[PDB]
């Protein structure tokens, strides 16, 4: 009855997913044929059909073939539902008026139909999660198109949208500026919880605790699975102190309008290492507050904790993550808001973390720190420099004007942003009276 | 009075007046025309004649006046 | 307050709630009738002449020999109806239809009781009077009538079970209302009477069948 | 007797292929029948399993 | 015959009521399956006070459990003594609480809250003389802060002369597995102070240091901070259930414990309580009992009574045992400590002393004070209440839901207004 | 009904747009675009 | 005890004949030979055969089929192929001459060379007979031979078993791409004087199950064989709850009496569920909610006009498999709460039900093995456009008598025509006449 249901759009959502769901398949058990070798801990992301066929409950949907043609063409080739994996022919060329506006109102329609028909198998869908990439069409444009129908449609829900913003220095696109400024609305009014990622902070969590000295995207897909697995612990699994997807939104976003947490996973180390460490609940709890574990590159020795929810997964007993906690309540270089007294939701599974044949070690315990900072205005900014300075020289925007978007939506996607940061920055100040 | 003279201050009396989009969607809203399920997705808005359409793709047969109207 | 037999009905002091209201004793929605439709088009013989005398319906045709087929039965539908210009034609034609007769009344029997089920299944009380007095003119007009409505006494009879006890208390004081005839549970009685006395051989078994009260006559 | 699982028991099992031999008795709904022979596919799916 | 509906509202509550009917089994003599193996007839003789009897000697608890979640509860049913409930009180839903006051009484709490009130009608009048209702919750969160709430006003409706007892664990300060704990923890003591007859305040800390310091134990689970609030509802409700003198049932501890009628918010205490190291330097007797339970750290709410003064008290004793030294316990720590009790009410301790020791155990003791110590507790929450309400911060859910900006200010004037007694009884 | 006081033409106009936040993260960000920038240092001078 | 007789009329029909029968054949459990598996079981065994078959008291199972053409090349097919022993050579009949898609040459001129003899074959049929269920004609409303010989045996078998049901299957003229040019003609010609004559007539048009196979069963190239394949299914799931036992078995009479409102309104929509396609098979639940839903979607109907575009009057779903009633009758009010599902307002009751316990079987080829299927034949007013449609058609070519010599000298009159395109608009009125809401 818990069930949720994914939707990868783009490249990133389409490999990021691959990641997933190989590690989905390891936990409950289902094997990559359907079948699960020799008890309803699987309803939320695999529907089963009589005869242990355990199928998924997502819709990989990329613009262009290939990236989902290798998951159709791969090891997990007979497990997701030929139609579920949604592909066109045309990418949108990093344009998000290609995704949103030309190649995208042509398989818009299809998507909605496969989510229905997996969102009317479920007989409680308590959210969807969904993976895109703001950077290219199928990244922001289609996720702007999809989440504007969805919300219409599948509307007293959920939206829990996973991302991976522009970093704050690499990026890979010259048109990146341009498309993240423009899936604003996507992300502040047309979602729930919008978990932001970074290449460049993963990439440092990778050269720096799992030792590998040149990461590659599967590594950091991974990094993102397990971050997932932890939210959706407390909905398969069973724990003491368990949380919903609804309940970690209510001891979070706190105004309506600030929705946009970070996260940081906990014992990233890899096997050597984790031979010299005791990763005690106090080292895990320790180790997430630290601006480095961080996921996005933004110090948080510059914002106001607003509200962190830390959620366990293994040998932790209540008592010390309740002395953890306090311990972290003592240092003052992590100040909160004096908005937020009791500043944590504390939530405990049980299965310990699953293991993939890779690299992040095999713990007894590990915790995921949603937190909602007021440091994630230097993102918002950072991007908002870049947009600015070519927006001025009208650069590399004959291309969206030439698929739709009239000019007029750059300048108010600019104004939103702007609005945003206001909101971010100014909440964490102290009380004038 | 402390409350009322702190409540109504301004940089939180906004942020707690505007409400977004999906927030107005869960406040115990009530939307009659809408799909409750792919009979309904296929059936009330298709746009699509099976007497006058002929020989079109899966992602054909449904084309919704929401598809093919403007944003917002 | 408790709803039904619930657990909630046997509450020490539990107030009950009744059940609905019933459609027996209230009146029913009326419908339009084909003497509305007939009379605007206008195909029937009659005229009121409108006399000082009383209301007359003057007729055009012979009255003897008009059809009685689709003339009788379909003035039996009038008495469905309230509204002036329409209530005297169905009266004064129904019940001089049935003064002049004889032979021809009989086969038409099987086809007006549906008019008068319809005429009785509303419940206003001056239009079940005045079907009443069409019924006991009926059963008196002419022969074997009544030999051909005893196979018919048990669908026009339940409406006349309802309002049999709906006498008039009024104590020593006397009812100065017996020259309009309208007391329909008198009426009731006086249609069954009729009916027992003007119905043949055997028609005390189908009459206490429908009403179930009844002290026989003729014994 | 019509297509449904036949009962074995009091307790209510149905019977299996793992109990029905060549010339066996086999009790159902009050009646014993004694089954004597079977054909080649039978044979092959029995000394199969 | 006099007899208890014992509910649960929550997670905290189910798993507290789990481990009540767990040790109350123990202490009857009912094993999992419903049957009696026992030693004594005294056990039998009230049985008829928390189990209804069925075919074949079935004793099932009279006990309706909620929850919006059907997960605690599928955890009480797979739980040792879980197959002894009966499956259609077990009233559940498909949703999810979301920690919300306004979602667990203004929302699918009150569209399950009329099928809860079936069955609880159901065993309330499976009966001859009912005494009253135990309703076990969390203050703090969704459907036990909720919806335990609304099943107290509706029950105080439908019955309005038989005792409710209300065990509620109070949001704790040193830590917190939930953020809008002030807000749920408000809305509930609004309800909790028109309404019940006796509410129990359990904090969690006061049970870790009794966990940690008292028994010593190394790794306090949750169920070993269960135990003490199982045992407590043992203590209280014993002389109601097993033989003895100065029986003092529930209205009595009510009348020897409620002066006023708003002030009838307690602090329990069990107090054979003593660690495996320290468990054979022990001299058992009444005056280590008196001692345990007015030494001020055994206390099962996170109040120090040497802040405020004592109204009240109440003492259940249990076992085999001479008044005199009870009397003379009772009367001493009254003449030593003269400025801790009020001097408006002689001689504000009582005794109940029943015969039969629970399991395990030959004398025990439980501790009942209505002390002025709440009023830290309930100005705490208000002051965090006041911080995070200040802002309307977490505030939208509940308006968009259905709360009004005016109740969770008239539910912090009648807050602030129940500490206003309590303080000026502390100074007179 | 209608009135004469309604065929009047209103003179509201939109009250002019305040000006965007400039963020108090600018400087910071500017800064940190001119780190790490040496001008012709591996291609070199032509 | 309860048989068919089935006659295919036509190369359409000898060919829908061709795949029925294959899959009878080997859904009963009979090789191609004519008998029966020695060393294999069968599907259970009992007297499920009769309908279709006849023992000659040897073991060889005869069917009861008149494959009749008037053009060889057709019936030389079956005569020479896997099937070749299984037919009573008697009962394969073939004239010399082709009826080159004329209604003359199949109804009034050639004719009359093979009616006789057909006419006793089905008499020899019906004698070996306990109780006569009906005859199943399978025929187009295109070629000379479909539309003229079916005519001519419509009339012939009114008058010898006038009391007995005969349900007609079909192929109804495609809209917009269509094989040849005097379609119109044949059709309004054989529909005219079949409309007083078929009980009950499915059509079902060749465009919908192109469209079926390339958007549902994922084939870019399908052909007459997958098609007729698709239709065997159908008139299986129609004629198989008189063969096995089912928890509402549902018989043609009560087919005719729960479909037909009016006797000239029996032309029913078929369309079928689980037309999937093995590897998207097993993904699925194919719940009875689904394949209930998907009959009344209107993309797997099997005739090219709307279910939207009109008004349901009566639909008769048959369930196969592992079917509860209690999950049919919840798809069933999930669908009557549906606003754009639209009944009339004189049929409160619109769903005639019919559930057995045999599952589909599958022929080698295109459709999966699903243990839930359903045909829904849905009697509604949405075939208005559809007849509408040829009517124009018609009247674009008559209105120049256009390849209207052709028919006329070969002993045809010319009113014929102007008689038979009167009957469809009289058709046309009596569809909106039943069809509009009631006021009075
Ligand atoms: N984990 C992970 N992240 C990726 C992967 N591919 C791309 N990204 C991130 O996504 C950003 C842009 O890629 P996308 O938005 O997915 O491009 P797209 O959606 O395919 O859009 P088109 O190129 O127009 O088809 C890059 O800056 C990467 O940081 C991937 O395979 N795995
Ligand atoms: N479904 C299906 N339809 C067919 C098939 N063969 C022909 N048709 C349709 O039937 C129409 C004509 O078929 P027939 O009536 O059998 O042709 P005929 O009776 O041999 O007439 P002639 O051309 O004069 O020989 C064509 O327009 C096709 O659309 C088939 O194998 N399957
Ligand atoms: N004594 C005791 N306290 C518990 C137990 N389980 C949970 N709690 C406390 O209950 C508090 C909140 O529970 P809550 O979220 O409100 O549960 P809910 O009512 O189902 O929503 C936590 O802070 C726990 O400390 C238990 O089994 N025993």
Avoid at chain 1, 179 to 196: G, K, V, W
Avoid at chain 3, 113 to 142: E, F, G, M
Avoid at chain 3, 190 to 219: H, Q, W
Avoid at chain 5, 361 to 377: D, H, P, R, V, Y
């Amino acid at each position: 009855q818990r069930e949720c249901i994914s939707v990868h759009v783009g490249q990133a959502g389409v490999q990021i997913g691959n990641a997933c769901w190989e590690l989905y398949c390891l936990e409950h058990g289902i094997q990559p044929d359907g079948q699960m070798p020799s008890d309803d801990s699987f309803n939320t992301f695999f529907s089963e059909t009589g005869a242990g066929k355990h199928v998924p409950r997502a819709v990989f949907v990329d613009l262009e073939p290939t990236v989902i043609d290798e998951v159709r063409t791969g090891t997990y080739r007979q497990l997701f539902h030929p139609e579920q994996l949604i592909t066109g022919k045309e990418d949108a060329a990093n344009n998000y008026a290609r995704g949103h506006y030309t190649i995208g109102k042509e398989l818009i329609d299809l998507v909605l139909d496969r989510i229905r028909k997996l969102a009317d198998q479920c007989t409680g869908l308590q959210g969807f999660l969904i993976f895109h990439s703001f950077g290219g069409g199928t990244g922001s444009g289609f996720t702007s198109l999809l989440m504007e129908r969805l919300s219409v449609d599948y509307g007293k829900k959920s939206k829990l949208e996973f991302s991976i913003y522009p970093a704050p220095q690499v990026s890979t696109a010259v048109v990146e500026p341009y498309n993240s400024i423009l899936t604003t609305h996507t992300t502040l009014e047309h979602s729930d919880c919008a978990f932001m990622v970074d290449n460049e902070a993963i990439y440092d969590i990778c050269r720096r605790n799992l030792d590998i000295e040149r990461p590659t995207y599967t590594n950091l897909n991974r990094l993102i699975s397990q971050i997932v697995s932890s939210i959706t612990a407390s909905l398969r699994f069973d724990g003491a102190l368990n949380v919903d997807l609804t309940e970690f939104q209510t001891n979070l976003v706190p105004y309506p309008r600030i929705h946009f947490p970070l996260a940081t996973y906990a014992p990233v180390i890899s096997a050597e290492k984790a031979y010299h460490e005791q990763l005690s609940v106090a080292e895990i709890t320790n180790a997430c507050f630290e601006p480095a574990n961080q996921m996005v590159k933004c110090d948080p020795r510059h914002g106001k904790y607003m509200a962190c929810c830390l959620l366990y997964r293994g040998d932790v007993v209540p008592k010390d993550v309740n002395a953890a906690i306090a311990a972290i309540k003592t240092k003052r270089s992590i100040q909160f808001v004096d908005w937020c007294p009791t500043g944590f939701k504390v939530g405990i599974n049980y299965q310990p973390p699953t293991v993939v044949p890779g690299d992040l070690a095999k713990v007894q315990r590990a915790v995921c720190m949603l937190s909602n900072t007021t440091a994630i205005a230097e993102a918002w900014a950072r991007l908002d420099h870049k947009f600015d300075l070519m927006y001025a020289k009208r650069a590399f925007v004959h291309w969206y004007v030439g698929e739709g978007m009239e000019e007029g939506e750059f300048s108010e996607a600019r104004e939103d942003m702007a609005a945003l940061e206001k909101d971010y920055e100014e909440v964490g100040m102290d009380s004038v009276e | 009075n402390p409350t009322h003279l702190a409540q109504q201050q301004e940089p939180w009396c906004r942020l707690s007046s505007t409400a977004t989009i999906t927030s107005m969607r869960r406040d115990a809203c009530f939307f009659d025309p809408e799909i409750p399920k792919d009979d309904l997705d296929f059936r009330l808005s298709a746009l699509y004649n099976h007497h006058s359409g002929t020989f079109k793709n899966k992602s054909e047969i449904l084309i919704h006046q929401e598809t093919i109207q403007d944003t917002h | 307050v408790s709803e039904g037999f619930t657990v909630k009905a046997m509450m020490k002091n539990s107030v009950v709630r009744g059940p609905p209201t019933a459609g027996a004793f209230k009146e029913r929605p009326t419908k339009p009738t084909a003497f509305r439709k007939f009379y605007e088009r206008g195909d029937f013989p009659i005229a009121l002449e409108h006399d000082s005398k009383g209301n007359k319906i003057a007729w055009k045709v012979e009255i003897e020999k008009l059809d009685y087929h689709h003339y009788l039965p379909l003035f039996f539908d009038g008495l469905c109806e309230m509204t002036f210009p329409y209530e005297f034609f169905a009266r004064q034609g129904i019940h001089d239809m049935l003064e002049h007769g004889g032979n021809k009344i009989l086969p038409v029997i099987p086809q007006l009781i549906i008019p008068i089920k319809n005429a009785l299944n509303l419940r206003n009380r001056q239009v079940i009077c005045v079907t009443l007095k069409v019924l006991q003119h009926l059963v008196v007009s002419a022969e074997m009538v009544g030999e051909a409505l005893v196979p018919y006494y048990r669908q026009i009879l339940p409406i006349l079970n309802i309002f049999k006890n709906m006498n008039v208390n009024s104590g020593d004081g006397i009812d100065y209302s017996q020259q309009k005839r309208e007391n329909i549970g008198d009426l009731i009685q006086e249609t069954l009477e009729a009916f027992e006395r003007y119905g043949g051989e055997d028609a005390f078994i189908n009459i206490k069948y429908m009403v179930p009260t009844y002290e026989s006559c003729l014994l | 007797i019509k297509r449904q699982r036949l009962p074995k028991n009091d307790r209510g099992d149905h019977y299996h292929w793992k109990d029905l031999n060549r010339g066996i008795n086999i009790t159902i709904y009050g009646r014993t029948f004694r089954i004597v022979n079977c054909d080649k596919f039978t044979q092959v799916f029995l000394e199969s399993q | 015959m006099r007899e208890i509906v014992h509910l649960q509202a929550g997670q905290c509550g189910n798993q507290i009521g789990a481990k009540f009917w767990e040790v109350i089994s123990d202490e009857h003599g009912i094993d999992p399956t419903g049957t009696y193996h026992g030693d004594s007839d005294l056990q039998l003789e009230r049985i008829n006070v928390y189990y209804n009897e069925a075919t074949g000697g079935k004793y099932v608890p009279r006990a309706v459990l909620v929850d919006l979640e059907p997960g605690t509860m599928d955890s009480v049913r797979s739980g040792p003594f879980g197959q002894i409930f009966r499956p259609d009180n077990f009233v559940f839903g498909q949703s999810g609480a979301g920690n919300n006051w306004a979602k667990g009484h203004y929302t699918e709490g009150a569209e399950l809250v009329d099928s809860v009130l079936d069955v609880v009608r159901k065993e309330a009048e499976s009966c001859d003389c009912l005494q009253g209702f135990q309703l076990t919750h969390s203050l703090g969160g969704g459907t036990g802060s909720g919806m335990g709430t609304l099943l107290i006003s509706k029950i105080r409706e439908e019955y309005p002369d038989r005792i409710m007892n209300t065990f509620s664990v109070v949001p704790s300060p040193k830590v917190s597995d939930t953020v809008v704990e002030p807000y749920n923890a408000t809305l509930s003591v609004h309800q909790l102070v028109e309404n019940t007859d006796e509410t129990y305040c359990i904090d969690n800390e006061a049970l870790y240091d009794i966990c940690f310091r008292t028994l010593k134990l190394t790794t306090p689970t949750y169920g070993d901070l269960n135990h003490l609030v199982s045992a407590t509802m043992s203590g209280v409700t014993t002389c109601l259930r097993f033989p003895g003198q100065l029986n003092a049932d529930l209205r009595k501890l009510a009348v020897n414990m409620v002066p006023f009628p708003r002030l009838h918010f307690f602090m329990p205490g069990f107090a054979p309580l003593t660690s495996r190291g320290s468990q054979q330097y022990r001299a058992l007797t009444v005056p280590e009992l008196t001692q345990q339970m007015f030494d001020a750290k055994n206390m099962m709410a996170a109040c120090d009574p040497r802040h405020g003064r004592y109204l009240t008290v109440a003492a259940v004793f249990r076992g085999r045992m001479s008044m005199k030294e009870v009397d003379e316990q009772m009367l001493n720590v009254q003449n030593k400590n003269s400025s801790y009790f009020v001097e408006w009410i002689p001689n504000n301790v009582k005794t109940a002393v029943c015969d039969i020791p629970p399991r395990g155990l030959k004398m025990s003791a439980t501790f009942i004070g209505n002390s002025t110590a709440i009023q830290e507790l309930f100005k705490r929450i208000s002051e965090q209440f006041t911080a995070m309400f200040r802002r309307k911060a977490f505030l939208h859910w509940y308006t968009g839901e259905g709360m009004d900006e005016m109740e969770f200010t008239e539910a912090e004037s009648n807050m602030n207004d129940l500490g206003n007694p309590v303080v000026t009884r502390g100074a007179c | 009904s209608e009135s004469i006081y309604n065929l009047i033409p209103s003179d509201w106009k939109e009250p002019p747009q305040p000006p965007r936040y400039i963020s108090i993260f600018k400087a910071t960000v500017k800064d940190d675009m001119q780190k790490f920038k040496t001008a012709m240092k591996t291609m070199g001078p032509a």
